[PDB]
Design a protein around this ligand. Structure first.
Ligand SMILES: [Mg+2]
Ligand SMILES: [Mg+2]
Ligand SMILES: [Mg+2]
Ligand SMILES: [Mg+2]
Ligand SMILES: [Mg+2]
Ligand SMILES: [Mg+2]
Ligand SMILES: [Mg+2]
Ligand SMILES: [Mg+2]
Ligand SMILES: [Mg+2]
Ligand SMILES: [Mg+2]
Ligand SMILES: [Mg+2]
Ligand SMILES: [Mg+2]
Ligand SMILES: [Mg+2]
Ligand SMILES: [Mg+2]
Ligand SMILES: [Mg+2]
Ligand SMILES: [Mg+2]
Ligand SMILES: [Mg+2]
Ligand SMILES: [Mg+2]
Ligand SMILES: [Mg+2]
Ligand SMILES: [Mg+2]
Ligand SMILES: [Mg+2]
Ligand SMILES: [Mg+2]
Ligand SMILES: [Mg+2]
Ligand SMILES: [Mg+2]
Ligand SMILES: [Mg+2]
Ligand SMILES: [Mg+2]
Ligand SMILES: [Mg+2]
Ligand SMILES: [Mg+2]
Ligand SMILES: [Mg+2]
Ligand SMILES: [Mg+2]
Lengths: 70, 101, 87, 116
RNA sequence: UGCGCAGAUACCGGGAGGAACGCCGAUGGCGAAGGCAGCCACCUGGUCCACCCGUGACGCUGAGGCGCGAAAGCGUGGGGAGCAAACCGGAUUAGAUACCCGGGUAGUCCACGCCCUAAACGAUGCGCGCUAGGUCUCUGGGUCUCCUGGGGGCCGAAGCUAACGCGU
């Protein structure tokens, strides 16, 4: 499976308002993908988390979702 | 004075009479706290990821301001007063950290 | 906090000569200013104990330098005390 | 006396019992069954066979109201959680979609000593 | 035992209230120790890197003193959703003053003041100098297969150790 940073452009990890890119880092649920699946560095994951959590308060990214499977 | 970004989400049911009022209200409050505005981005109607105040959408505003630091919380408190105002998040501006550069 | 505008204003006030950033006089003054910024920060915030440690160490570093100035040149030591209003 | 003909079926699966509720599209229930609704009384309620029958008991009751289309909602881990679903698919009720909505806290409430 | 026909459980909507922060989360980071996880702003401490600029031994440790110090517990006033000493029950059992089940007060939370303990553990006091490396990792600088700092791990030279083991 590909990693998120691998198939992506040059993007601002600190921009909490770009949902199209930030959506790519959330799972089928509202959770944040671990570093194994994001391919991001340690520092890059720390930055992504807070900016994702920021967008969650503006209503741009979901807190949690519903799994349609099983 | 430092440079902050003011995010504002309001009730997306307002006609022009109410929208202009709520906006010029924000203008008057920024003047009273001495916030010099640099640029502004009005996105408007947007699909929220979860219902906020039972409403599925929101009307968005973004300001880039330079204002005194000690007045930030008193400005945030002043914005959250209005009813149509729903979210107020004031963030210190930062350098645009790139990734996959 | 303490901006570089205020910082240079203290250094240039206490510098033994132009370009002097490290004199015992310059250090004691710069310490003194952080003392008051913290001690006014600890007037309120009486429950902030972690920062209160930095102030203890600051006060120690100041007394050690003042104890050094007292030994070498006791005239400049009085000048530095009387200009900062300490002890 | 309703004729909804479509709606939602909620599966609540715990380790001590499994119970099914069947609602109209806006969520108001129609008929329901459980491991106790069928004959079972004790720990037999937590068995998957009980979940199978409870699903079918609720399915047949929904037939009386004309239910054909069913959206499945699942809440909880437990035996027969799946066996309740596989009983719904073959009950004759077409399963529109299956979703797992089990409420998970963000660490807000201290659990009982059992769960720590 | 208990709860349920005074309509519970399950399901949808609305409201209130308190406590804790899922994913990120790490074998990770920070602090002197205790300890510190939603997000935002303000106040603020420590620390690390480069430049080689300034001071010119100004250093180390530290009996006393002083300040800090998980939990539990104490005083006053608040607060009280969930958990839950004591206790009330249900079972189990030879007995059950317990493990298991239903309840439930203090307390757990807040403020202000006490209390000064701990397996407060690295069971390893602090500072500096010296003595092979290999590898994983957090964070700086660099002419950026790599070199160079400052932390966090694992193997292991010499050596030490009663042995386990320790080993820039
Ligand atoms: Mg409001
Ligand atoms: Mg049972
Ligand atoms: Mg009864
Ligand atoms: Mg009764
Ligand atoms: Mg409800
Ligand atoms: Mg209440
Ligand atoms: Mg974890
Ligand atoms: Mg440390
Ligand atoms: Mg510890
Ligand atoms: Mg800071
Ligand atoms: Mg700082
Ligand atoms: Mg030199
Ligand atoms: Mg000289
Ligand atoms: Mg010392
Ligand atoms: Mg002592
Ligand atoms: Mg004390
Ligand atoms: Mg204590
Ligand atoms: Mg306590
Ligand atoms: Mg008390
Ligand atoms: Mg209880
Ligand atoms: Mg109990
Ligand atoms: Mg008993
Ligand atoms: Mg008995
Ligand atoms: Mg026995
Ligand atoms: Mg003692
Ligand atoms: Mg020794
Ligand atoms: Mg580098
Ligand atoms: Mg090292
Ligand atoms: Mg070893
Ligand atoms: Mg040897």
């Amino acid at each position: 499976k590909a990693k998120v940073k691998a198939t992506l452009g040059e993007f601002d990890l600190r921009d909490y308002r770009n949902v199209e890119v930030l959506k790519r880092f959330l799972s089928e649920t509202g959770k944040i993908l671990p570093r194994r699946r994001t391919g991001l560095s340690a520092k890059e994951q720390r930055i992504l988390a807070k900016t994702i959590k920021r967008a969650r308060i503006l209503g741009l990214l979901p807190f949690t979702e519903k799994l349609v499977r099983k | 004075m430092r440079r902050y970004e003011v995010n504002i989400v309001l009730n997306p049911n307002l006609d022009q009479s109410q929208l202009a009022l709520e906006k010029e209200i924000i203008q008057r409050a920024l003047e009273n706290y001495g916030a010099r505005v640099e640029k502004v981005e009005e996105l408007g109607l947007r699909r929220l990821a979860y219902p906020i105040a039972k409403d599925p959408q929101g009307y968005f505003l973004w300001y880039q301001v330079e204002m005194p630091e000690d007045r930030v919380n008193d400005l945030a408190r002043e914005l959250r007063i209005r009813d149509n105002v729903r979210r107020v998040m004031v963030v210190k501006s930062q350098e645009p950290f790139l990734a996959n550069a | 906090p303490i901006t570089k505008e205020e910082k240079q204003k203290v250094i240039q006030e206490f510098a033994r000569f132009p370009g002097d950033t490290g004199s015992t006089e310059v250090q004691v003054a710069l310490l003194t200013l952080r003392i008051n910024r913290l001690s006014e920060h600890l007037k309120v915030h009486k429950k902030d104990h972690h920062s209160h440690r930095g102030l203890l160490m600051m006060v120690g570093q100041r007394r050690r330098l003042l104890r050094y100035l007292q030994r070498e040149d006791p005239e400049r030591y009085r000048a530095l005390i009387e200009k900062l209003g300490i002890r | 006396k309703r004729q909804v003909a479509s709606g939602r079926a909620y599966i609540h699966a715990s380790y001590n019992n499994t119970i099914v509720t069947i609602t109209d599209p806006d969520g108001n229930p129609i008929t329901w069954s459980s491991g106790g609704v069928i004959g079972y009384k004790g720990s037999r309620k937590g068995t998957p066979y009980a979940a199978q029958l409870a699903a079918l008991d609720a399915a047949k009751k929904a037939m009386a109201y004309g239910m054909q289309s069913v959206d499945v909602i699942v809440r909880g881990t437990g035996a027969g959680r799946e066996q309740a679903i596989r009983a719904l698919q073959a009950s004759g009720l077409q399963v529109k979609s299956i979703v797992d909505d089990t409420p998970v806290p963000h660490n807000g409430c201290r659990p009982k000593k059992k769960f720590r």
